[PDB]
């Protein structure tokens, strides 16, 4: 009763945290990729 | 019950995926850090 409802709520919360981390991972990679594209034109 | 167990397995798969992404981002990041020592400004 209250046990199951407690576990579902933890699962729902965990999946929301995962969704956000997926967005974070995607956004970090978008920024990293722009640095990779420019870095081949850098003078060393 | 079995819908929750399956959700737990799936979530752990998503976590494994994100751990691999983090490792890969770090590896690529380390090469830019190494190269940045030789940079002209």
């Amino acid at each position, epitope marked *: 009763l209250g046990d199951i409802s407690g576990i579902n709520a933890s699962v729902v919360n965990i999946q929301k945290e995962i969704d956000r981390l997926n967005e974070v991972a995607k956004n970090l*990679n978008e920024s*990293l*990729i722009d640095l*990779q594209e420019l*870095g*081949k034109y850098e003078q*060393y | 019950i079995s819908g929750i167990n399956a959700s737990v397995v799936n979530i752990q798969k998503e976590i494994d995926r994100l751990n*691999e992404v983090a490792k*890969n*981002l770090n*590896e*690529s990041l*380390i*090469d*830019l850090q*190494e*190269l940045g020592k*030789y940079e002209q400004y």
Partner: nanobody
Amino acid sequence: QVQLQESGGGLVQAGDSLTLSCAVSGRIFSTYTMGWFRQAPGKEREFVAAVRWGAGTIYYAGRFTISRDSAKNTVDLQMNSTKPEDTAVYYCGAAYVSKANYGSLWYQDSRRYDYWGQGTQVTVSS
């Protein structure tokens, strides 16, 4: 950047070995990865082998041997006991830093490389 100059291709009788070579010029850094790719008629560009310039780590798709000579600044692909299915245009490519952010098999994806040699035909006959 680096420049890549391929040589060593051409006609070869099946069973003979052939060595392709890629002469690398320009600013080579330890972060580079060099790869060999090939394009046969009626297929898409296929990954063959790659080598990390600094550490020398090697990756394969065992009849072919990749190696790099940091003294002569070359990357070599030794093809032993050639068969007619090895007929293709072979390309040397260089990626200037690890593109692992695209996935662990990034080095097999020719889009991840930044510089290319011109490609040389290998023809395995009779």
